[PDB]
Design a protein around this ligand. Sequence first.
Ligand SMILES: Nc1nnc(-c2ccccc2O)cc1N1CC[NH2+]CC1
Ligand SMILES: Nc1nnc(-c2ccccc2O)cc1N1CC[NH2+]CC1
Ligand SMILES: [Zn+2]
Ligand SMILES: [Zn+2]
Lengths: 113, 113
Amino acid sequence: PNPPKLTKQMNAIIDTVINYKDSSGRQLSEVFIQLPSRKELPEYYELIRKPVDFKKIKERIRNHKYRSLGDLEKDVMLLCHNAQTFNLEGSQIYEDSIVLQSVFKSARQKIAK
Amino acid sequence: PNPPKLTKQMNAIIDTVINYKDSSGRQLSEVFIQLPSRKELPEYYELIRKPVDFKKIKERIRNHKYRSLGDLEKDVMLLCHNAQTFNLEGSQIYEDSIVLQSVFKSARQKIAK
Ligand SMILES: Nc1nnc(-c2ccccc2O)cc1N1CC[NH2+]CC1
Ligand SMILES: Nc1nnc(-c2ccccc2O)cc1N1CC[NH2+]CC1
Ligand SMILES: [Zn+2]
Ligand SMILES: [Zn+2]
């Protein structure tokens, strides 16, 4: 298992990302918590080779799959980059995923550095 | 708008480039569909003055921004030349971008000439 404070730092960072609200009170992470299934949106799985959602990221913290904050960052960047790949530039989901990459990076800097 | 057959030729050429697989079954265009964002890879935007990806190229065909196959070629060459500028010689991304320039040129010759 990971050291307790590393798991605590990962949960604090991911909770900051998931709970973040924009100035209109909207929780930007909402659509990213659970991917649509292969039955609901088969086109997503045709285009995205490594799907991931925040439910999977929290599971990977619980199961100690990430060995560092760098490992955690790689999956959060993947989730957002996948959203940017599937969606059109300027769409709400595409733009929300860019904001969440900034929220992750600043939360990591506050909580760990 | 462009004449329908010109848009058809551009989509046929770009679909050949995007769908191309090497002999190991790998779709070489994968990494080039959507650039990493400025938050994910700020160094790319510091070094590359005119970033472009295949999502942008398909948008420019849809919006009739390219007025000829020469205009289309210039952006595909830019994408690959940018990949060669950012990456080290001999890296997979650098070498894949050289192969895609050949795939574009041969697809243009088949489909249009
Ligand atoms: N368009 C979409 N793009 N991306 C996601 C998505 C969800 C979780 C993790 C990563 C993701 O990229 C969900 C999407 N939609 C939700 C609303 N219904 C249409 C489909
Ligand atoms: N190294 C990289 N170089 N180039 C691109 C790239 C992407 C789209 C269009 C043009 C490009 O040049 C992506 C790169 N990487 C992807 C994997 N993660 C590390 C960054
Ligand atoms: Zn749904
Ligand atoms: Zn990425």
